[PDB]
C-alpha cells in the first residue's frame, strides 16, 4: 500500500493518478502510463529529476514553457504537472500528457513502412514543424524516438528540452559536449559550430528521419562526430569550399577539406525501392550547405506530399515564442524558481 514504485523509483502522482505501468525512459525522464481517476482514461506521465544539474533544469524549463504555450494537432500537449508544494521540497517534476501508443524508433524496429504510411507521417512531421518554426523556435533534437504515434496513424512531436528561439548570433557552447542518447540526426554545422544555428538544422533532421523510414537503417550513424561526418561525406560526396565555409573553426574546416575526395551516391542507388518523389524531396533536405536546404513551407508544397497539401489547414503560432530572460547563464537555483513558478497553475486549489 502507498505511493507506487516503477522500475525501482517512486512515482508520487497519487491519489489522482494510479495503476502505473512502465513505458520507457529517455536520457532524462522515465515515462509511465497511469489511470486518471478524474477523467477516467489512461495518460502518460514523465518523471524528471533535474535540480542538481543546470542543463537538466534548462531542459525542464524549456520543455514546460514551450509545450504549455504551443497548441497544435501534431505537437504533444501538457495537461497537468505534479510537483511538491514548496520549492524546498521539490526534487521531481511529473509532466502529464495524452498517452500515445508508441514512437517511431520503436515501430521501425518491428516493421517496414509502406509508402502510404511514410508519406502521411512525413506530412504530419512537417505540418508540426511549420508551427514550431512559425514561433521562431528550433526543436534542435528531432529523431524517431520523439515522434509519437497511434494505431490511427496520428503523429505528435514531443521532447522539447533542447528547443531554442532562433538566434544566429547566440553562441552556446555546451551543446556539443553535453550527453544525448543519439547524435545521428544532427546537421553537420551543429556537430562543429557553437553558433549560427538556423531552422535548417531541423530540416536536416527530418531528412534523416525520412531516409530511415525508407530503409529502416539510420542514414548517417557513427561513433562520434568525425565518424558521422565521414558517413555524410560518403553519401553526399565532398563538400565544396563554399559548402564548408559555414564551418567556423578553421582547423575543422581544413581537416574536412583535406579528406579524400568522395563522389555523391545517387539516391536511387541507396534506396532502389523508394518513391522517386520521396527521393527528390530527400535530396533537397539533405544538403551540406544549410542555406541550400529546402525550408518547411516549400517542403509541404513538394509533389510527394500533394494529397495532403492544404495551406488553409496548416496553423501557425500567434506570435514568436519568447523566454523572459536568457536561460544559459542562470544558476540552477534561479531555474528551479522559474520552474516552480511555471508549474504553480497546476497545484491543487490554485
Amino acid at each position: 500500500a502507498g505511493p507506487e514504485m516503477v522500475r525501482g523509483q517512486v512515482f508520487d502522482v497519487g491519489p489522482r493518478y494510479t495503476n502505473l505501468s512502465y513505458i520507457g525512459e529517455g536520457a532524462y525522464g522515465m515515462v509511465c502510463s497511469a489511470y486518471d481517476n478524474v477523467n477516467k482514461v489512461r495518460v502518460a506521465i514523465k518523471k524528471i529529476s533535474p535540480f542538481e544539474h543546470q542543463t537538466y533544469c534548462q531542459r525542464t524549463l524549456r520543455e514546460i514553457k514551450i509545450l504549455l504555450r504551443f497548441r497544435h494537432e501534431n505537437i504533444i500537449g501538457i495537461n497537468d504537472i505534479i510537483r511538491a508544494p514548496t520549492i524546498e521540497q521539490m526534487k521531481d517534476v511529473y509532466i502529464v500528457q495524452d498517452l500515445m501508443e508508441t514512437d517511431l524508433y520503436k515501430l521501425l524496429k518491428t516493421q517496414h513502412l509502406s509508402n502510404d504510411h511514410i508519406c502521411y507521417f512525413l506530412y504530419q512531421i512537417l505540418r508540426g514543424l511549420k508551427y514550431i518554426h512559425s514561433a521562431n523556435v528550433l526543436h534542435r533534437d528531432l529523431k524517431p524516438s520523439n515522434l509519437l504515434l497511434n494505431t490511427t496513424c496520428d503523429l505528435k512531436i514531443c521532447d522539447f528540452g533542447l528547443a531554442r528561439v532562433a538566434d544566429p548570433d547566440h553562441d552556446h557552447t555546451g551543446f556539443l559536449t553535453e550527453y544525448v542518447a543519439t547524435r545521428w540526426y544532427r546537421a553537420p554545422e551543429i556537430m562543429l559550430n557553437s553558433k549560427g544555428y538556423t531552422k535548417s538544422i531541423d530540416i536536416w533532421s527530418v531528412g534523416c528521419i525520412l531516409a530511415e523510414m525508407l530503409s529502416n537503417r539510420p542514414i548517417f550513424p557513427g561513433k562520434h562526430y568525425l565518424d558521422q561526418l565521414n558517413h555524410i561525406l560518403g553519401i553526399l560526396g565532398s563538400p565544396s569550399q563554399e559548402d564548408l565555409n559555414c564551418i567556423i573553426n578553421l582547423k575543422a574546416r581544413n581537416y574536412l577539406l583535406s579528406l579524400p575526395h568522395k563522389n555523391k551516391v545517387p539516391w536511387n542507388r541507396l534506396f532502389p525501392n523508394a518513391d522517386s518523389k520521396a527521393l527528390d524531396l530527400l535530396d533537397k533536405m539533405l544538403t551540406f550547405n544549410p542555406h541550400k536546404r529546402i525550408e518547411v513551407e516549400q517542403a509541404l508544397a513538394h509533389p510527394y506530399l500533394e494529397q495532403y497539401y492544404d495551406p488553409s489547414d496548416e496553423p501557425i503560432a500567434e506570435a514568436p515564442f519568447k523566454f523572459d530572460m536568457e536561460l544559459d547563464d542562470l544558476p540552477k537555483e534561479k531555474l528551479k524558481e522559474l520552474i516552480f513558478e511555471e508549474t504553480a497553475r497546476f497545484q491543487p486549489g490554485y
Binding site: H117, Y120, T151
Partner: peptide
C-alpha cells in the same frame, strides 16, 4: 503495433474531402 491505413486518420480524412 498494427497501423490502420492512413485514410482512416482524422487529418487525412479532412484532406480527402
Amino acid at each position: 503495433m498494427k497501423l490502420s491505413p492512413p485514410s482512416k486518420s482524422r487529418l487525412a480524412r479532412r484532406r480527402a474531402l
